[PDB]
Ligand binder design. Structure first.
Ligand SMILES: [Fe+3]
Ligand SMILES: [Fe+3]
Ligand SMILES: [Fe+3]
Ligand SMILES: [Fe+3]
Ligand SMILES: [Pb+2]
Ligand SMILES: [Pb+2]
Lengths: 317, 317
């Protein structure tokens, strides 16, 4: 029996929980869980646990060090490792430094903790690949400062991670919450839902042709994780919209479509930089259609109309 | 070859990396790793992966629901679940909202991500135990508002999680960094290194007598994780002290010994509340010696002299 009788009044009421701005209820108590979709993403993520080094790199090392890969094939591998190597850190740091603080709900935060740790595992993966192949890790991890197409994507990303980090930033104003939703869109929809996809397609294409299968298998595990990251982000954005409808104005909607169009342009320039002529039957041309196609799929998931209407040239994805 | 030639100047120099206040080097690039101990804790944590529900609770449910446990035995289980259930959230939220931002080093942050996710797994564990035993999760998770001995520990904890959360808090002053080190001490040394131990001993004592073994096995996995959390915290505090020696004044040292003495008092009151008369051969008396003994071991690890000099009554720990 409680020896602080008044404490019983602090048990959390399910119906008082909210995704953001919830400071009327004790955020430290997990129960009763309200957003079951967040708990499900958490359990699914936990079930997907994997260790990069359980994947053998022996055949990849032999192939990489032989004369059987073309310079154009090596280029695709190097450019994608360059971009992914720090993109994980950008995403992980954003979850922690920007999102977590403002998602005032314990079960959603449970998932964020799983998500951020999975970005650490992804980072470990690129380090393992670099050291396995004998690449200079310092050069690969610094790609986003040395390769214009990668830097452009990451500089674009900063244009949204910025604001939310200010010491005085708050989500308890319509404009503060809109700014927060733009950050969620920038990281979940754009970075994780678009910027990683040309790369997934290129790397998984090697795998399908039985080349660099160790890297291919690791990217398959990463893609499995990223699918959940994206689905969680979509549910979070949709949940915040539902609980704060005054936020989802024609103006915010248009700003979001604008950010997505800009990201599509940057992702196309990145796919062209990876494929100046083409390898494995892929041509940069195909990525214009593909990047525009997934952008339409992302738009629809957060209630916006598709704008490109292009067909998917990689249905196996 | 870099297409942004100036970018090559941004590769990180190993000797410019620091644990705190490091804004002269790109914190987003993991390499080259400098604090290898952090990377080791990370790999060790990853290797310890476990899922609470892989541990069977059938025998525990049968025992719990039978008439074979005494009210005093049930009390120990209920009080510890009450305290641990939200202590994990307090720790996880602190890592994210207070520590991560100020530990300006990517490999240390890699570990923090593993640590925070493990606190989520611990939280899952208590929910699984509650639902398995048919306890009312809302009452258990609200224990820190309903039980004075638990609330006292958690209110004490807030006295340090506070400051570092202020919008204007910074570690680039000797007093700001001292305040940050007091928070690290409060969470790693005190919450994780002392406040969890009477509970570990009590629960593991059931396990040793073949009672509630499912809960006992889960606590064994939690203890294995917490040992690394503590060791990482110790290395971090010692590393920060080494790189910012002007911080470790007689005054900070005394304030730390003071906080530890206060925590020992609170932990003893908590052990007495769990054992008003004793079970399994344990008496509250033994915890006075034990809590004081581990406090001495923690003091020594961060370079302070032991002050209690008591012997350990539970060497099997
Ligand atoms: Fe990732
Ligand atoms: Fe991700
Ligand atoms: Fe824990
Ligand atoms: Fe811990
Ligand atoms: Pb452009
Ligand atoms: Pb007292």
């Amino acid at each position: 029996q409680a020896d602080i009788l008044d404490g019983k009044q602090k048990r959390v009421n399910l119906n008082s929980k909210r995704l953001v701005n919830c400071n009327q209820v004790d955020v430290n108590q997990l129960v009763p869980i309200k957003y079951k979709w967040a708990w499900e993403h958490y359990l699914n993520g936990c079930a997907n646990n994997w260790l990069p080094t359980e994947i053998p790199m022996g055949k990849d090392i032999e192939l990489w060090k032989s004369d059987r890969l073309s310079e154009d094939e090596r280029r695709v591998i190097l450019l994608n490792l360059g971009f992914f190597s720090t993109a994980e850190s950008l995403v992980g740091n954003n979850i922690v430094l920007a999102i977590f603080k403002h998602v005032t709900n314990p079960e959603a935060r449970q998932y964020l903790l799983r998500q951020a740790f999975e970005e650490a595992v992804h980072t470990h993966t690129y380090l393992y690949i670099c050291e396995s192949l004998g690449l200079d890790e310092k050069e690969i991890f610094n790609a986003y400062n040395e390769r214009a197409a990668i830097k452009a994507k990451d500089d674009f990303q900063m244009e949204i991670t910025g604001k939310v980090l200010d010491p005085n930033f708050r989500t308890d104003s319509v404009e503060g919450l809109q700014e927060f939703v733009k950050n969620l869109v920038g990281y979940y929809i754009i970075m994780e839902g678009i910027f990683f996809y040309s790369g997934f397609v290129m790397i998984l294409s090697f795998h399908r042709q039985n080349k660099m299968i160790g890297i291919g298998e690791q990217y398959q595990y990463i893609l499995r994780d990223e699918t959940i990251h994206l689905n969680f982000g979509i549910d979070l954005i949709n949940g915040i919209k539902e609980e704060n409808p005054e936020i989802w104005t024609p103006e915010l909607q248009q700003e979001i479509v604008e950010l997505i169009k800009r990201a599509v342009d940057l992702e196309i320039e990145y796919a062209q930089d990876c494929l100046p002529r083409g390898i494995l039957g892929l041509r940069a041309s195909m990525f214009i259609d593909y990047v525009q196609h997934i952008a339409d799929r992302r738009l629809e998931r957060i209630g916006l109309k598709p704008i490109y209407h292009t067909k998917n040239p990689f249905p196996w994805m």
